[PDB]
Amino acid sequence: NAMALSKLAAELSNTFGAISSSISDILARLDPPEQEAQIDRLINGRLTSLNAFVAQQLVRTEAAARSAQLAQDKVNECVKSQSKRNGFCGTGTHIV
Amino acid sequence: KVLPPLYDPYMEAAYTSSLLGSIAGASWTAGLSSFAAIPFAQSIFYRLNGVGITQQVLSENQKIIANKFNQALGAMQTGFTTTNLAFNKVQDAVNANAMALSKLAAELSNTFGAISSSISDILARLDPPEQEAQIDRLINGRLTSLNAFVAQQLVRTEAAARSAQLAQDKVNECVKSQSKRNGFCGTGTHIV
Amino acid sequence: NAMALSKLAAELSNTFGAISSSISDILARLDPPEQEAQIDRLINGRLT
Amino acid sequence: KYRSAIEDLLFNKVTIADPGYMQGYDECMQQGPQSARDLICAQYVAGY
Amino acid sequence: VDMGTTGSGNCIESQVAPDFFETARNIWPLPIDTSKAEGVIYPNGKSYSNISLTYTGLYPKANDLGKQYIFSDGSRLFVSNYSRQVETFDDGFIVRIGAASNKTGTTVISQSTNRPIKKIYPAFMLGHSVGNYTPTNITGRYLNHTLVILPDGCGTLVHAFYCILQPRTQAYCAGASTFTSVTVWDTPASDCANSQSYNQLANLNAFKLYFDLINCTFRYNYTITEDENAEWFGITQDTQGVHLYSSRKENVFRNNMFHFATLPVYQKILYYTVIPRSIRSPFNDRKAWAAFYIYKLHPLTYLLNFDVEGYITKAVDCGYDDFAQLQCSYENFDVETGVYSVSSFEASPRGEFIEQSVTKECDFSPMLTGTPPPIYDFKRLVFTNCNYNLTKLLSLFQVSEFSCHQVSPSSLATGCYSSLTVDYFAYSTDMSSYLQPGSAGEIVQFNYKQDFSNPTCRVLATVPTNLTTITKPSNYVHLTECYISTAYGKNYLFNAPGGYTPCLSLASSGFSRDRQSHSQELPDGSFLTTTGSVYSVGSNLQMAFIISVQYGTDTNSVCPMQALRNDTSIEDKLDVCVEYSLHGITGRGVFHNCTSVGLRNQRFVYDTFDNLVGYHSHNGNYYCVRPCVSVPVSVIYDKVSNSHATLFGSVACSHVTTMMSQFSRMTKTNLLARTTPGPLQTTVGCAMGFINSSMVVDECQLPLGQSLCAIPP
Amino acid sequence: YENFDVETGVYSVSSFEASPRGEFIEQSVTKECDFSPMLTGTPPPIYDFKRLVFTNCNYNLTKLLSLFQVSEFSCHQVSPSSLATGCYSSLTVDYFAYSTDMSSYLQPGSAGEIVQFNYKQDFSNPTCRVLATVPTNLTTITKPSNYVHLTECYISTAYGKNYLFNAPGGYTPCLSLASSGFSRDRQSHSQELPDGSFLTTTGSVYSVGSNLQMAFIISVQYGTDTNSVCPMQALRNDTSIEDKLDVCVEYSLHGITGRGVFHNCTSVGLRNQRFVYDTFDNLVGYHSHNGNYYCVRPCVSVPVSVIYDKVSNSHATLFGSVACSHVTTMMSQFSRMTKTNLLARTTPGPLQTTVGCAMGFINSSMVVDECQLPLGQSLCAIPP
Amino acid sequence: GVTQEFIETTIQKITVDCKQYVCNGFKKCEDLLKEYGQFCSKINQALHGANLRQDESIANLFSSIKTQNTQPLQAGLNGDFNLTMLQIPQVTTGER
């Protein structure tokens, strides 16, 4: 959970090949014909990074939903009742 | 680098041998706390009795049941062909393991738009203002490829951990005990 | 299912930094030294 | 018929763009450009 | 170079009769075997091993019969019409030498004899222009410098030279009244020392008898080991010269042609003729010689398989077959049983669909009359719905700089736009650095800033003294300041990109002296001040043109003055791949008849992904545009039977038939001929190579979809 | 891992030690490329340019460029300085008489009659365009009467004006028609074709200034087997038989350059190629002049694994998949402490295990049921 | 009837030398790559964590040996059931 946020925040500080990671610095230091190229480089990199972040967030959300279903199963089987299965509610003969 | 597996093949052999030796048991008591030394044949006949075959039939057709079991075990060899789905899954896992390495190695040979895929060639053929851009292009491409490889490796590791949990469940339910479920341990009434 | 197809089709219409998203437009408006760069940009984006 | 009544209701309550498995390449010309099934008709333009 | 002693004396007469060599009895068809990598030039980029790659280059078509050339042996020599047939050197050709070299031979002049066959090296005459022989008017004479490949040394050496073939006048020689064909004789009856070691110049001497070699740039020769294995020879030309390929080079026991010579022939070779060879074998030791086959080289995609030793053992002609397309799409010679979606590798010739709106001509007359305005007071011309002639405008100026952005100077004269804006003013080219993007100084700040929001070109040009319509001004004037003098002072006003200076009205009075200042009191009590720099015009007046263009989606009305005809797609160029240029919109596509759809008043129809889908033509007919590879092709392959079939997913069979010029060559042939296993309509598309069987199965390894299975033969 | 406080475990680490590198130079003996036709006679007109192709020779670009006053040296995919110190499979030079005042007409994508009908540059290979002035001292090159370039090259049809345009790097179709020079400005030549149409060309004639000016279009090609076109260098042929073996060097072998470590290796590969590549186009082997096949590896090739125990604050090194003898003889790749420990025959020396060479370990008979430092293959590192 | 099923438990564990993979030990490339942040260290940590998690998962799966009672199966026929196909052959010529 912390790493997702850290990657999202830290991907805004790297230049991605441009002269600077700040759009203001690029606008101040360069002129429209090169300003467009540098800002486009920054835009391409940040778009790719944000798309990767969104895909990873979708994957994590689906995994968390499946794990929540598993937790509901565990609550129904091991907590609210006694399980005759082996290894579902820990090693040995499950009690509570 | 390809890291060695955590266990020697002898340890895996010991695991499978312990699995084979854990097949026989009471199979009728209400827990996992006691171990009975009932032999393998008696355990198999008790599993058949639990399936719904009365003791009279088991006593009558002892040799017939043993012969059918032996025929099944001997016909187990024929399943190691491309027609079988499980063998296809084994080869698919091997091919995925090989494909990860092949992609990782082959991504170092393509120029990604630069004049060359070699940093030495770029340094020799170009000069700082242009070679900086070419090396930056190569770096950006290689970083994207490495990030994709690491993400795919994380996904594969999580999938392998979940599949190992499923394998432990299958060992506990089908191998170490008899299954009253349908389709968890194959089609039909599970025996062993 | 619909959104996979929509994304696949819509990724062919955006320029990725090039002067145009059409290879024919790039070939008509530019010349080999710059044509190669623009087409390479489009190719790299589409491959990703 | 190949659908139960409850199946008919469930399928009628869900909107799915019909892929022209048969003669769908020619059906896209007759219909013309439509936003609802543009992704289905983009098969023969995008290349999927 | 020295070509040797000039030949003297008469030539040997030859009897020309194609009716003997070109007979159905002598036809021995040897199609190109792609499974053996026959006639495949080994790529010079690298020497790969144990891997299968696709390659684009000059390769022969699969199962190509080529052209067969048969030579005989002699007194009077017997030859065919080869010396007068002028073939076209399109991309090069490959020669199969001595495929039969141990079988029985049927001499075309002799009869009832079966001598062991011996291989022969072909002789070629490649040139740029072709013509007639003067005394006979027979075609096959090469003018100017001519490249001649000539085997020699009784077959152990090949002569390659490039120079003018001046015909002689002595009888039986080229350029004489008694000239029939350019035949060259080996004469192995002690005139080549065939019994002894092979060393002679008989072939070159015969050619020198036929032609006079003068002004000859180069003359190389390459030793050939006297063997009897089948050989492969190839020739191509590129910017580096003429390249010769031989299988003997790296391994005569292999089938790969490796580069072994580059010839400094940089002019394009357009024609080649096979020099007939009739050797003089006496009746004591007469022999039957082999025949060589010439296969044309085409630009094709090939899937090459490299051996563990690095040699190409087998190849796939990607566009030949649907199974070949399957192999090339997945880059796998050994493909497992299944149904695959394959790509298109066949390249078909494309027509042109041109529809240009009729418009008047844009007038650059104000740009070419009077005195050009100063930079701060530049004149702007905007052109819409007109035909421009940029050649006419640019031929009156001596351009010194043609910097362009997002467009090329050449494309600025052959492209169509929705608008064409030109800002022109007097500007000294010595001040070129001050007009550059991002430049410092007063020119950008106060006089003119270029607007890089549209494809724009900056032209710095010199007005020649001959052009008297443009009058040189007194000086060059540009503003050095434009500011509002407040209490603190110096509130500089800067030009917007493409706009005029705020001090334009103040500067309208002009500047007569250098560093002359003008001031105006604003109603707020502040003073608006400007200053101008005045410098003299040199020998020739120099101007600056800032051409900016805009590309439209519907109609690019500003089109170049082109005399292109308005093509008709009603009958021709329909359902076939074409390169269209309609009202300024260009691209490649396939046009079909459709009922008029799309938004009204619009010439072009686009989908939600900005793909050109429809087009309303001048003839009142609406057409559907496709990306020239639109029909989905699925190949059903059975490995056990080694049989394949094609499924055209989602397409009706009639449209598959009409749209036949998009698939592999074999598919095109099968769609042309009304074969009895013709296209079959199924529930998953049009099926080629299938039959409805009314068979019911419980499982299948080739599922077509929708509960359909392909039963292999 | 950029972590001062690393947890207990076995880690794959990078190489940060920089060691001095030698040089391995092996250059083939070749003749000298002759630029004499470029420096004698009158330079050809632009539409009738002369092409020189150099293969398997040694060029002195300094000698050629010292005789000219270069005004423009625009290059593509290569540098003007790298054009004098690089090796090529071929070197093509197109040269002609050209006024530097017409520089903008020779630029890529430029409009006008120069690209359309006289010369179009080819950008499929690394190419350089040089605009140079011939000094008056150089008297071997004779100034022509004028500068001549074609303004038209078309086939006159019924509709007329079927313009013929130059292919990149090729000659104009009107070259044979323009064989007869243009004595006057705007002189036109027409030729009747067998189709009945007329092929017409027109030339622009303008006088040569005080100094004759030329244009050189240098295009180069790079080969993976042997770059025979190499600059004339007095570099010695270094020997890697004893020195520079098992250590990182900067090699330049027959035009192929890079960094790597050379090992003795039994000759494996194709029996003709000098260089050996794998399926991923990596230089793996090299057949040397001394008849010995060398077995190229990158500067950092040996996998180094560090086994760290936080509690004891002790660490050990595992050289995965490497024999200990090769680790010893190939010590100039690791950290300074590792190099020192490999130089001196310490009693806890390199140890051969089933997962590679181990440094800092001892063979033990101890059997454990679990460990926090698994080396792989049922091996555990017991911390001191 | 015998139903055959494969359940994977491992993947090949790969550690990548990010610096060498990206830059091949070139100082210019390393200086240019340093502008991308801490990419190589993060890649190394991610791969190390994945390999560690796989190691713990496999150790957990194999830990059932320590707490599983068994019986010594007879070599060959176990009663009338032939288990030779599933048993490890015992040969004294060499190692087990």
Ligand SMILES: *[C@@H]1O[C@H](CO)[C@@H](O[C@@H]2O[C@H](CO)[C@@H](O)[C@H](O)[C@H]2NC(C)=O)[C@H](O)[C@H]1NC(C)=O
């Ligand atoms: C093969 O070609 C070589 C090189 O062109 C020929 O050798 C030259 O022959 C000419 C006369 O034809 C002499 O003037 C030169 O001095 C020769 N040597 C050179 C250029 O190095 C040779 O005659 C040709 N024919 C063979 C070897 O049979």
Ligand SMILES: *[C@@H]1O[C@H](CO)[C@@H](O[C@@H]2O[C@H](CO)[C@@H](O)[C@H](O)[C@H]2NC(C)=O)[C@H](O)[C@H]1NC(C)=O
């Ligand atoms: C029990 O099964 C084993 C293993 O399948 C059988 O041993 C095989 O016997 C055949 C026939 O004699 C030999 O060809 C093989 O080499 C043996 N080994 C294997 C591994 O197949 C054995 O015959 C079966 N029956 C009994 C009674 O032991």
Ligand SMILES: *[C@@H]1O[C@H](CO)[C@@H](O)[C@H](O)[C@H]1NC(C)=O
């Ligand atoms: C027009 O767009 C609307 C958007 O809500 C959509 O519902 C409708 O079906 C569209 N009509 C067409 C494509 O004919």
Ligand SMILES: *[C@@H]1O[C@H](CO)[C@@H](O)[C@H](O)[C@H]1NC(C)=O
């Ligand atoms: C021989 O070739 C000539 C052209 O050189 C051709 O006109 C003639 O028909 C040919 N004769 C045959 C094929 O018999």
Ligand SMILES: *[C@@H]1O[C@H](CO)[C@@H](O)[C@H](O)[C@H]1NC(C)=O
């Ligand atoms: C060749 O052509 C010329 C010109 O038409 C003609 O006069 C002559 O009779 C022809 N035949 C010859 C020279 O055999």
Ligand SMILES: *[C@@H]1O[C@H](CO)[C@@H](O)[C@H](O)[C@H]1NC(C)=O
């Ligand atoms: C060559 O002669 C033939 C004789 O039929 C004639 O038709 C042809 O025009 C001539 N060609 C030339 C180029 O003179």
Ligand SMILES: *[C@@H]1O[C@H](CO)[C@@H](O)[C@H](O)[C@H]1NC(C)=O
């Ligand atoms: C080429 O041949 C033609 C036609 O015979 C002739 O007029 C010309 O002088 C020759 N030479 C050149 C350089 O064009």
Ligand SMILES: *[C@@H]1O[C@H](CO)[C@@H](O)[C@H](O)[C@H]1NC(C)=O
């Ligand atoms: C041969 O070259 C000379 C100059 O060496 C030239 O004068 C003559 O015209 C040329 N002869 C031809 C091309 O027939």
Ligand SMILES: *[C@@H]1O[C@H](CO)[C@@H](O)[C@H](O)[C@H]1NC(C)=O
């Ligand atoms: C013909 O015989 C020769 C000599 O033995 C042999 O090298 C060659 O392979 C044979 N076949 C052909 C097709 O030349």
Ligand SMILES: *[C@@H]1O[C@H](CO)[C@@H](O)[C@H](O)[C@H]1NC(C)=O
């Ligand atoms: C354009 O201008 C040129 C100037 O010479 C003229 O010859 C030509 O006819 C004009 N029109 C075109 C090229 O369509």
Ligand SMILES: *[C@@H]1O[C@H](CO)[C@@H](O)[C@H](O)[C@H]1NC(C)=O
């Ligand atoms: C190259 O040419 C220069 C010209 O001064 C000469 O001094 C030098 O020896 C030549 N050779 C080289 C640099 O190898």
